[PDB]
């Protein structure tokens, strides 16, 4: 059984590498019933709701139009959870389209796939920009 | 063999492991001519 | 079965009210082999390690010396997760001993007790300030 | 059916669950612990 | 037509239940061109002009930072008023962020919205404490 | 020299001033502030320990303001907040202290709902009057 | 007789010449009782 | 023949008195080919265009929702113009719905109606809030 | 007939370019019986008497002693008026002798010349600073 | 018909109106006086 | 199909005509996700922050306050970029607010609109006052 | 250790550095920066008093580079500004000074358009190169 | 006799405390033929005139409708004047009815009572806001 | 002679006068109305 | 030498008399390196940090506008402490600007000045309210 | 790795935590916090109606705290504010609620004066302890 | 008394030597009544506010942050003036922070300091970048 | 022997002038076995490893490729040290490629050359940005 | 003896040293490389 801390660190490295190297394959990280929210607003001004399902996750990611996003990961904290899952808490800065970096707080929940050993998928993805709620 | 999603072992690394190069030069070839000069 | 959002909101209300009123009773939220990460810097200016078990969580909470610790819950996200758990991300301001309000993020993973329905316990608690990361 | 704003009947009542307990606390134990003192 | 007393009691119970539980959706009680004045918040803290509209009311309520806002309603007086509306004067104790009981007086003017029968919205919402004015 | 009609806050402040000055001077004339279907309650207690109910008519109101000696009453208004409401009317929230026949200064909470008379412009009458002492509630 | 629009002479002034009064009191009646007192 | 300064001062006072008292009668000031713009923004950050004709002027005035507007006329400058017309330059403060006063710049162009002596109508009305363009 | 907006924007460009370059030639814009009100304070302080005719307008313009008058045209409105004339309201910033930019309003009434088509002269010019009014 | 942005053919040229004159200046006099020096 | 040189000359003429005549209409040249960079003062005058989108481009152009922005185009070089777009490099003298000629170099990348044939939009707009960097 | 493929500004800066270092050291090797249908002008001037035309193609782009006698070229870049463009391209704007064969510092204006090679990721080739001396234009 | 500064400070304390508590008793500070101006705006917009005598002063004070008049005395200057009187200049902030604090200046001239020793009456009271003049 | 800071003995006592009256108020009357009610 | 109880009572009397009478002279009670921490009041509002030195103490006292501060001392406890100093704990009711009686607790640490016998100065001054804490 | 001496605020907070935990658990051992010349009052009330007096030594403090019969005390500290004072000492201001013998929560007001012991560095003892319930003072 | 031309040439050499080498000691050239105007920067650099006194002049020089200022003095004109002072008008090229040669014109008024013979101080220092006004 | 402050000032001027003008010639300042630490985050935020020798220093400088670096030297301290060398601490702002100015500190240790008098070489150069460590 | 401000005779000249060289540059190489180029 791998260390949850190293599992979370490796997952964060791979996820934020793929977020800019090829954002259109970010949906491959998620499973059949996975929650995803990436810190957006709307007309009412309230934070955007999450989406569920790989397809809706892919649609939302494509709508988010990530172009060469640079992320500075300032803190990663990974710990054990239900069904040998891993909960990851990420503090960092993300800048999209080479604009100003924005502080962000993120929570990942990765569950084992079940068949392939040492394999995980993103069950939950919660991303929020600090400047949108504070 | 720690993998995430359906990505195979080292697929993301392989895809994202490519240095910035210009023209047909191999990486680190251009600065070699400069290093030839003192 | 109650809404994940309802469960998260009610838990956040109860937790951050009990933290202000009776910090010594905060250990009853957690169960066996539950993770508690709330902390600041280590002896070498590093984020602290996790604390496991109800007794040790109580010991750590008492160390934090929470004096009239209020709260300013700017945002709460609650999503259903594996094993019917609820993952809550709480972002806001926390002031302890009436000092300046410091921005904070906190990830809760609430597992469902198998005995009684509509019963949860904090399987994971990961608190982290901002001034200490950026 | 007296309802207010855009809330449907019983929406506010549905917004709360009295059977929801966390940890070893019996229902209403936290409320009793804090509101009383 | 429902008795003015009955609609006042209904509204007071629902409004403070929502205030204690989910302050982030208090704006749904109000409509367009509805006025909401709540205490004071300024550089000096005493003058806070009223806000109008659901979106501005939601902004103001988000500023009020209601967290576990407990309320003990000592008295409610509901009377019939123009356009078959009701006027409610409520007196009680309010505690936000787990402070002590502060005596408060609120005046609501609720108006029917026309289409749906027995449906009201908060046209006017005036809040005051006894610490601000003797 | 614009002839701007007064703001709701100015209307409420002026009405509170006139109402309480009249109450101090001529309580019997106070009934002229109310209309046919006006509601009025002024800090009463029944033989139950509960707050008293309200009368709904200038006549019942006159009987109420008459029953209430209201003789030589000193009032100190600490807060007035007025806003616009349904049908051009004005809702006023009044916080103050009152004393009738020179007892102690009792804190009171009041809510006024004034409505335009209609036939005459810039004229209002007290449609609703809710008054409660803090002693009989808290 | 300077007028604007189709408004008649002094129409706007009359439409706007009405003091603030409460109840059935004529303007300046309420303060008269106070002025009776010293 | 009356003084253009007197005509401008009387028109300004009458126009703002009527705007405060009965804003739904403001269209009576204007004529067949009158132009009316009252300083709005529309979906691009660019000032709103003017409207022409008495009916369109009335519709725009009603849409503008003038509720108990208070004005402080700080400067009026009236001068003669073609066909004995009057051009009026107005500097002032206007507050709608008893909110904060906003500095405004206005230009009126009044023309003789032709048959009735000393009778004018608003051929042009340009109104702009300073805070919307500066 | 050229668009009133085009006429106004072209006239504003020409006028505020000639003001900076050759203010001695500004009098050629006006004709006989033309009002010029550009001014500041006097013994009374608030009003400035208008000057009529090309000679008086040139005398007054030379009196203002324009020196590298820089202009920042924030907004310009141009509408048709009597006798196919154009009424222009110009709002912006003016800086004389490289001093601090001051907010200004200027009302132009351009009357068409009856002899030559596409020809206008400034029948009315009313300039007014803001800092001197508020 | 080469067009740019959302402008139609001749829309930008329609904003020039070089035959417009103000005051007693002949066409081009103002720019001639200013741009030259 | 049209000569890149012909497209470049057409665009340079139209763009620098519209810059002098109607600066507020420059945003129509650009489209969504297009980049405009033109000096500007974040605080010191050197920080040049790129803006994207028609609305942000409009705001940046308005902040520059181009007034009688004259330009003498000394040289234009037009070539064919990818996806059948064009690249224009223009060298010339620019004078804003009737100041002296300043040497400037601008680089436009124009992309075909796609639907209408022979239609282009400014995808990239990099402006530089040569004197600023030399 | 997020890989984080370089931003357009970093790509442009690195390309300018490599291009001008190669031009100083081995100008004959500079032709490898361009593709089959690359456009290239470098401060030309025909016998008419006008700037020279363009060259489209790698082989004769090399001939044009050879024709200019590039020997011991000293260049000082004073400004580089790069941005993203069509087909994940990079448009670079360069302000600088150049001297070939040790004449004076001639101030120059340059525009680069680089496009992905496609076969290999993170690889670019100079699709467009526009170079003009200011004296020959102003 | 006491120090002029002592007299001024004591009078300022008593006056601005009685103004908050019992404004109806404020008339007892003044005697006959005592000047009291407290205004700034009237029907014509000119500064308010003066009311002389205890009765008129009481009538005016009552009109001002003082309601919980809070004060913040930034500075008090007290100097001896002719006939052993005291001249006090009071600069500070004044809020009526818990509204925004407005800057104010007030000149008091206190005349000694001939009969009783250590007794003064307000011979002159001159109040002026700042926002109503500047 | 217990003193505090740079205060001479009796300076604070001399800082105020208890027989200073304004208007027709008797000594201490203003305090009496404005102390508590 | 003097009883600590006598010293504490004498202090309390003088300090609160001067607070009621001449708040501008409170800084004379303290010396250099002395500390004055009052109740939470600042731009943020809660974290009112301590200030040191006579001049900073005077600034803080002036900021905390003291106008007719009525104080009812319910209890005073004076005890001997290091350097033959005294410690005074005072409980009572404070009313500033004529608000209501607010429960307050103050802690003074007074040290002998050394030069003059029976002379003390406020070395430490900690003020706290009941409402802002309980 | 710096060995910084704790700030007065940290010292006061830690002392309050230790003091009240010991009072809850082992009140007999509470006397070890005080020194020879230590003053101590804890919410006293003599048979007159006035607050009690102070003991001035370790053994009298011991006897007194046994006299108060602290058994299973629950304390909720709402405020602690510590500052430096004479001789490197710390003055602590404590606001809270206390209950002895499972009684109601009583608001208490407390001032501590801790002084360095002198022999061992970073060691303090309670020189002064003033504690009063607000029920007996208000 | 020496030749004013010699005094001017000596001062110009010393001043533009000390400006190049040690800008932080430029304030020693001025007295207490000296005036120093140089450039200007409020929002875009147009308002040139003169500063007076050695300390304010040093603040201004330090704000300008002269770093390796190279000066080519094309011309110097020195003349005698009141009270046997000197007036120097210098024309040249200035480059600060290694920018290009910018044409500049400076006017110094030097006054004898009285006590020490043949000693002067810069009473007036007016600097102007020619390009910024032309 | 020159003053250490004089040596430090002259060296700072020459070094930063050469850095702006000809950064490729910066290697001539250093000798053999000289330390060069200028840099930022290498791979994981670690401090940049020092490069020793003229060849490595030149390679590292060319790697940083300062295209046009403008420096605002806020302060320079120069003190004597071992072997008559000079230690300089330079604090200021640095902006590469006309980007935003960033605060920086730089420690130079200049060692004298035993061959030629008044000759120094940069034995140590330690550059550090502020935003990268704070 | 003509001086300005508060500087002595030749104080400014003493503030500048022409013999101060850094690295391999001759006394004036940096200035020659910077100006007139």
Residue numbers in the entry:
A (entry chain B), C (entry chain A), E (entry chain H), H (entry chain F), I (entry chain E), K (entry chain D), ...: 5 to 138
B (entry chain I), G (entry chain K): 472 to 509
D (entry chain L), J (entry chain J), N (entry chain X), S (entry chain V): 472 to 508
F (entry chain G), L (entry chain C), P (entry chain N): 1 to 138
Article, verbatim:
The interaction between CHIKV nsP3 and host G3BP1 is critical for viral replication. G3BP1 plays a key role in the assembly and dynamics of host stress granules (SGs). The NTF2L domain of G3BP1 has been verified to bind to various partners through the FGxF (Phe–Gly–x–Phe; x: Asp, Glu, or Ser) motif.
The CHIKV-43–NTF2L complex structure was subsequently determined using the single-particle cryo-EM method to a resolution of approximately 2.7 Å. Totally, three continuous yet distinguishable conformations (referred to as Conformations I, II, and III) of the CHIKV-43–NTF2L complex were identified, accounting for 49.1%, 32.9%, and 18.0% of the total particles, respectively. Conformation I represents an intermediate state between Conformations II and III. Since the overall folds and interaction surfaces of the three conformations are nearly identical, we used Conformation I, which has the highest proportion, to illustrate the details. The overall structure of the CHIKV-43–NTF2L complex consists of a double-ring architecture. The two parallelograms displayed a rotation angle of approximately 50°. The CHIKV-43 peptide interacts with NTF2L at a molar ratio of 1:2, which is consistent with our ITC result. Four CHIKV-43 peptides can be divided into two groups based on two distinct conformations: chains L and J as well as chains K and I. Chain L (or J) interacting with two NTF2L protomers presents a compact conformation, while chain K (or I) binding to two NTF2Ls forms an extended conformation.
